[PDB]
Design a protein around this ligand. Structure first.
Ligand SMILES: Nc1ncnc2c1ncn2[C@@H]1O[C@H](COP(=O)(O)OP(=O)(O)O)[C@@H](O)[C@H]1O
Ligand SMILES: Nc1ncnc2c1ncn2[C@@H]1O[C@H](COP(=O)(O)OP(=O)(O)O)[C@@H](O)[C@H]1O
Ligand SMILES: Nc1ncnc2c1ncn2[C@@H]1O[C@H](COP(=O)(O)OP(=O)(O)O)[C@@H](O)[C@H]1O
Ligand SMILES: Nc1ncnc2c1ncn2[C@@H]1O[C@H](COP(=O)(O)OP(=O)(O)O)[C@@H](O)[C@H]1O
Ligand SMILES: [Mg+2]
Ligand SMILES: [Mg+2]
Lengths: 447, 447
């Protein structure tokens, strides 16, 4: 019944969604900005509609233009991908009210779980352990704020409730920096996400980032698809993700997986989502839920055989999961390296025209990207231009294949992080596995 | 497990040389690329640790230059040579010379190449082993036409003349009656002598309605052997394969086990070592042996997708003296995979299309695998086979595999030369291919 869907996104994820539609005989409508007319998926799409000028605020965040596009092409559903309006409760409400299927959760669920402050409360209520913190928004009373920081114990982190992508988070190591770190985060969050709401959380020094993939049909069925380790980070943003997570025992996998599946049923969750945790000394601590598909979804696909984009579409078309928990089986290992148009050392954005391009191939090699020779990477958007995912019968083979595939990958004409990713694959501690969320920056000697 | 071979010479070119190169690099084996003077810019040559030019462009002077190839191993201090497919891979003289010079032939023992590689000797052995063959001259044809007419009378007059030392569909002519017989034997002998340096021909009954079904084997040479399902390769032009798939449609679990066990038994009985394929004509529920490839095959990736076994790595493990790791009961068929060969030829007149590839884009996505050395800027030489790449698509079922293939072929861009991409698109759209079980004559009849 999903004859035509609007892909409310761009770049690599838009192409990912397009491919899934194409395989399923579903008509595609590519909505794009005036800077994105030459996107790969825009050229492969059945229909195209320019929804605004180059800036995201004036295009991909343009709610009325996106709905109008669905309206005028007579689409039935809208896939928001990740970022942009995918976790915008207002968007979902309006799409559904306009008579279109929103390929994601109900808006009440987006507001419960997509907003971080409310998410933590709902998880402390439902029987999921969280990181000790302010357990509410922070007020302007700075004596009250200091008491909190003393309860949980420095270092602490100030986090934006409406934040994402590593934005709106500042680490506080003592009272001397607390007032100004709160103020600057409120400001950064206000200008980046609207919402100036911030809370306080204990800053964990030695955890790993372990996240649990879930699918739920909104009819009372909910499964978990093992986990992903995403501990290799810079500026609180993921650089390498892998699945399964090393060193996670079957007893722990089942413990935490069942909690997340239970949480989904208890909240009536609908679609794909990810529960993100800080994992340290054998314990999981909930930090946030992404109520949407995630960038790193392919590594889970490769180890399970489950097509998560197709599953999202199954759920949106009103069909229950026909995958049961005992039918989920992990085989092998997959690693994903994000490819970013940025300086390999300074990490400042590198827009420009790609003058030469060559993609890697081979058994277990999966290249996810819209880039091509002669494609100009625009300055307006996130720097991630592609994803390289390698699968292998085991983790050593996955990493060996990634080294090989990074050696084949050519992207000339702009700076990229390919050199960085080769360095990480060659890191003896990454090869042993289980490095923490602070490792990459420590290795790079980043003050 | 034991240490891998330190260093190998890859004694081939094109897509199979790159495939072997990738396997070496995952296993930490150093690579030596021997190449002709026309192949300096091959992708695997550009990736190889060491390169040696073994002669000028013509294959006779380079990839068939036995002493140059062996000398190359010695100069680089390689310990083994992998012959790929074609060229010297089923040349028993080469395998002997390789061993007598102190290197490992990553292949069967030379004795086994003579027994099973030669088509006349292989028919004889299999018949003595109690393996059904196609009725035929059961011996080389001589020069007196009365005796040759008499053999055709016995078996029945669609007959085919086949070169004992032939391969790639070459050195084969169908004969409909007496009038054509003398000239057909004569032309087949002359073609064989020029192509394979062996003018030996035999006569076989020409089967009207069979499918091409072949069984993958893997033997450690120590007495253990397994099979890895079957492949159907019935879509052919000039008796050479165009599309391959695995598993073969209409082959049951019970039937697969029947033929697989017999092939595995045959390996133990003849002392086979390495990867191999037994090729059958499958007609009226019965298998009839036609040949054994005593080497890796072009289409090995379809079997890898549906079994998870890395056939090249297994070749290298076995050549390192490792016994088979994989037991028969560990081998499981999952899903379905299709391969479309990509050839630089006119899609309609099949005229060779050498030249510079000016634009190139590989297909990507879940379940899509691309096996090719080609790149934008690369010149396809006129000296060698037209096959420039292989596209392989996997799905949870055959319908999914075929829809994915369609889409992948549509994404593929190769400008500058003519290719058969458009024929493969016609084939995926063919109602009878979609049905399955089309016979070996279908593609040419469709045309
Ligand atoms: N709440 C949000 N609002 C707007 N954009 C977001 C939000 N969360 C994430 N994004 C954006 O979506 C993209 C993917 O986010 P990222 O955190 O890199 O991946 P993931 O969370 O899927 O692992 C980034 O460009 C990021 O800035
Ligand atoms: N309490 C904490 N202690 C230590 N690190 C944290 C904490 N909260 C977040 N982080 C760091 O920031 C990363 C992203 O956290 P998250 O809350 O999911 O932010 P985002 O919304 O940007 O995805 C984590 O992987 C971790 O490295
Ligand atoms: N006995 C042989 N002598 C020389 N070349 C061969 C021989 N057998 C196969 N080839 C070549 O090897 C390549 C692969 O053979 P082909 O028949 O296409 O694949 P396969 O038999 O692996 O399915 C082709 O170029 C073919 O011409
Ligand atoms: N007896 C036969 N009757 C009909 N077709 C045949 C026969 N033998 C071979 N062929 C056709 O030629 C193809 C190649 O046969 P094969 O002996 O494997 O030659 P090659 O060494 O060239 O691979 C087969 O797949 C089949 O389609
Ligand atoms: Mg997060
Ligand atoms: Mg053959």
């Amino acid at each position: 019944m999903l004859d035509k869907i609007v892909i409310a996104n761009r770049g690599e994820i838009a192409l990912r969604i397009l491919r899934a539609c194409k395989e399923l005989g579903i008509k595609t409508v590519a909505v794009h900005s005036s800077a994105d007319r030459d996107l790969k998926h825009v050229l492969l799409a059945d229909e195209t509609v320019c929804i605004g000028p180059a800036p995201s605020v004036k295009s991909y965040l343009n709610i009325p233009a996106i709905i109008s596009a669905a309206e005028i092409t007579g689409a039935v559903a809208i896939h928001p991908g990740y970022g942009f309006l995918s976790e915008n409760a207002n968007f979902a409400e309006q799409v559904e009210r306009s008579g279109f299927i929103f390929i994601g959760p109900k808006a009440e669920t987006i507001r419960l779980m997509g907003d971080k402050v409310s998410a933590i409360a709902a998880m402390k209520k439902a029987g999921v352990p969280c990181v000790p913190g302010s357990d509410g928004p922070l007020g302007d009373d700075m004596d009250k704020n200091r008491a909190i920081a003393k309860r949980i114990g420095y270092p602490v982190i100030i986090k934006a409730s409406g934040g994402g992508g590593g934005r709106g988070m500042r680490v506080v190591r003592g009272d001397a920096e607390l007032a100004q770190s709160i103020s600057m985060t409120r400001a950064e969050a206000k200008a980046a996400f609207s919402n100036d709401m911030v809370y306080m959380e204990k800053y964990l020094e030695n955890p790993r980032h372990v996240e649990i993939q879930v699918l739920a049909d909104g009819q009372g069925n909910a499964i978990y698809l093992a986990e992903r380790d995403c501990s290799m980070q810079r500026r609180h943003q993921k650089v390498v993700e892998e699945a399964p997570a090393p060193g996670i025992t079957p007893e722990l996998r089942r413990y935490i997986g069942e909690r997340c599946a239970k949480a989904c049923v208890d909240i009536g969750y609908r679609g794909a989502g990810t529960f993100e945790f800080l994992f340290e000394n054998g314990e999981f601590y909930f930090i946030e839920m992404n109520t949407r598909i995630q960038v790193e979804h392919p590594v889970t696909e490769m180890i399970t055989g489950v097509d998560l984009i197709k599953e999202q579409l199954r759920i949106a078309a009103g069909q229950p999961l026909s995958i049961k928990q005992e039918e989920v089986h992990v085989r092998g290992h997959a690693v994903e390296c994000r490819i970013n148009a940025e300086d390999p050392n300074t990490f400042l954005p590198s827009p420009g025209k790609i003058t030469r391009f060559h993609a890697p191939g081979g058994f277990g090699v999966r290249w996810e990207s819209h880039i091509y020779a002669g494609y100009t990477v625009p300055p307006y958007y996130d720097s991630m231009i592609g994803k390289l995912i390698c699968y292998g019968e085991n983790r050593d083979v996955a990493i060996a294949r990634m080294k090989n595939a990074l050696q084949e990958l050519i992207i000339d004409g702009i700076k990229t992080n390919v050199d960085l990713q080769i360095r990480i694959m060659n890191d003896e501690n990454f090869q042993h596995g289980g490095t923490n969320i602070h490792y990459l920056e420590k290795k790079l000697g980043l003050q």
